[PDB]
Write a protein that holds these residues in place. Sequence first.
Motif, short mmCIF file in Angstrom:
data_model
loop_
_atom_site.label_atom_id
_atom_site.label_comp_id
_atom_site.label_asym_id
_atom_site.label_seq_id
_atom_site.Cartn_x
_atom_site.Cartn_y
_atom_site.Cartn_z
N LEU A 1 48.26 15.18 55.08
CA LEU A 1 49.00 15.35 56.32
C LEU A 1 48.09 15.50 57.53
O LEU A 1 48.58 15.47 58.65
N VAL A 2 46.78 15.62 57.32
CA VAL A 2 45.81 15.83 58.39
C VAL A 2 44.97 14.57 58.53
O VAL A 2 44.36 14.12 57.55
N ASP A 3 44.93 14.01 59.73
CA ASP A 3 44.18 12.79 59.96
C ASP A 3 42.72 13.04 60.30
O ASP A 3 41.90 12.14 60.10
N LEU A 4 42.38 14.22 60.81
CA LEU A 4 41.04 14.41 61.33
C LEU A 4 40.72 15.89 61.34
O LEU A 4 41.58 16.71 61.68
N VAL A 5 39.50 16.23 60.94
CA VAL A 5 38.94 17.56 61.13
C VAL A 5 37.80 17.44 62.12
O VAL A 5 36.91 16.61 61.93
N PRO B 1 37.06 13.32 57.84
CA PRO B 1 38.45 12.94 57.57
C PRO B 1 39.28 13.89 56.73
O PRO B 1 40.26 13.41 56.13
N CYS B 2 38.88 15.15 56.57
CA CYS B 2 39.64 16.22 55.91
C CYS B 2 39.67 16.05 54.39
O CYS B 2 40.15 16.93 53.68
N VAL C 1 44.39 22.86 54.64
CA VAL C 1 44.12 23.60 55.86
C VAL C 1 44.95 24.87 55.80
O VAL C 1 46.18 24.80 55.93
N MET C 2 44.32 26.02 55.59
CA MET C 2 45.06 27.27 55.61
C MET C 2 45.05 27.80 57.03
O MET C 2 43.99 28.04 57.60
N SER C 3 46.24 27.98 57.59
CA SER C 3 46.34 28.43 58.97
C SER C 3 47.71 29.06 59.16
O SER C 3 48.37 29.44 58.20
N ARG C 4 48.10 29.20 60.42
CA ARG C 4 49.33 29.90 60.78
C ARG C 4 50.53 29.18 60.18
O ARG C 4 50.50 27.97 59.94
N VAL C 5 51.59 29.95 59.90
CA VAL C 5 52.63 29.54 58.95
C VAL C 5 53.39 28.30 59.42
O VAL C 5 53.93 27.56 58.60
N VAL D 1 52.40 10.58 64.41
CA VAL D 1 51.42 10.94 65.43
C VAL D 1 50.21 11.50 64.70
O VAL D 1 50.36 12.13 63.65
N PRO D 2 49.00 11.23 65.17
CA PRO D 2 47.82 11.76 64.49
C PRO D 2 47.73 13.27 64.60
O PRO D 2 48.13 13.87 65.60
N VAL D 3 47.22 13.89 63.55
CA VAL D 3 47.07 15.33 63.47
C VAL D 3 45.59 15.65 63.43
O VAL D 3 44.87 15.19 62.53
#
Lengths: 287, 325
Positions: free
Chosen positions: B301-305, B313-314, B223-227, B241-243
């Motif tokens: 590190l990402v649980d859900l898109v 599921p990313c 996931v490319m996003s803010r730093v 915690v879910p992300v």
Amino acid sequence: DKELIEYFKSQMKEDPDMASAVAAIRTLLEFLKRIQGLRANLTSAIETLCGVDSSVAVSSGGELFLRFISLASLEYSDYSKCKKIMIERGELFLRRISLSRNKIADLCHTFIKDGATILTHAYSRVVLRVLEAAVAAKKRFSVYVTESQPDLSGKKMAKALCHLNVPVTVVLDAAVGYIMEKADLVIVGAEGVVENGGIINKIGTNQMAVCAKAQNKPFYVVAESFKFVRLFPLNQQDVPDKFKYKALKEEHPWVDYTAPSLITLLFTDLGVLTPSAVSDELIKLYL
Amino acid sequence: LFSHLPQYSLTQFMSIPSSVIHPAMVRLGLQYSQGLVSGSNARCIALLRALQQVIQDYTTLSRDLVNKLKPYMSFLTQCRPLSASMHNAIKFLNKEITSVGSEEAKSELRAAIDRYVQEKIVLAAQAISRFAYQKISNGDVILVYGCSSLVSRILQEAWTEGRRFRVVVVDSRPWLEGRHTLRSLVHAGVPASYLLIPAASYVLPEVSKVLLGAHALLANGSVMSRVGTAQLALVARAHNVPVLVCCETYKFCERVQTDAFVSNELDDPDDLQCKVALANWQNHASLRLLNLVYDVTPPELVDLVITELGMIPCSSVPVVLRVKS
Ligand SMILES: O=P(O)(O)OC[C@H]1O[C@](O)(CO)[C@@H](O)[C@@H]1O
């Protein structure tokens, strides 16, 4: 030789809240009241007492008493003077572990946050005392307890802990991984603490810990000083068959080894301990 | 270091009635450079509106429009490095121009921007809002980060469709961008809390789910996003915690990247000094001020898109990259 077993069973009878190892200490101390062959008699008492209970605590609690008295024999030697210094030193040892659970409770009840929700295994007279001191310090929490087959000690604990006006839930034995996210911290009572700082508790404690480190829940152990056994397991086979078994095929071990990496802290008698710190203390308890 | 990635602090050379670059494209590029337009969705909307302005002023087509507006995108790559939403928008526009065969093609083109903005930036936002309404329950607390036009829309419509939650707004220097979330939450009446990234490990004990926004989803699921997002998701997993990341389909870039080093624009370092002990940083030869704009969090590190197609599921974002192309 046979009245020893009868007296040990009696110390179970008129004192259920007293630990198994302390019962072994008391009956072995009375047997001490009845040169170097007496050390052999006490070793035979260890063998006969461990042969009828087979807990880690009995063969460790009595085994420190084989050493807490033989340490005095390193200072001086006699024939009946040594027996009386043995009885006034053993009485000190025995009255110094009657205060163990209170010290553990005073150390550990400060680790429970207000409004917490702990998870505990089968039935510990030390975890029960930790929670009894935690509600006496006006903390309020929830207790999850596994029923912990085959003897259903979790129901006995939840019946012994509902009188404290605590919300207690007898969760199913399989459902540790389910409710594990509903737990702020895990408090278990060890039946023996092995030389690497890990513990030997009733079966199912290991997968309570493995789930704990899977979610970084702190896994606290409240053991006592006399439960420090000198074993060093590397897997669950390395636990002796003395301790695992009390007696379409059933297996039924009764204890299993929890690795020291899974344990956050031990609240023993002799202060709060890192799992590494236990090893030092074991060296100090055996020179 | 960060040698391949570009450092910038550009309209002095061009004539005031500019002929090298279109007037609308000059306005757009200078708004990108100064900071008047921020956010991947807002930048894509502004770019597509400026391209509609370019096409309606075009007078003659398929090759000519593409090689005419390639210098425009060179200018925009100079002014502020294009995010992948803009990249896929430009790719779609060039495919649309090359698809147009042998005046009336200008109106058909300009509506295809409107048919692009609606059913991939607006309707997609509504669909993502409907899907993320399911994952927002009563009483839970949600940690958002920075400002996202989609995350705040999800929170606001989840609140106005009857949920009773609480938001924690985590923010980072030097943009201080989550204030634009925070104020926009308070107008909606949502309970809010505000704190910086270093305090995230203080509030991840209470947070129920971390709801982030994505500037691009890459071809491996990163996931490319803010730093601050990757670091925040790492601490979020360490507090189990879910992300959730909420990204439209059109931001899916087929570029792949492992570490946070390959494509990460640098804003000007002069933003970093706070009220000073750092104002004279140019004269210190050894001292270099570094602020990234983007980083990538790994798909573990990402649980859900959440996507307008559904919740994925990313690890199956290349699935969506396949089925939309
Ligand atoms: O706290 P106690 O009663 O001394 O024993 C502690 C542990 O030993 C057991 O009673 C038996 O293994 C377990 O139920 C308990 O976890």
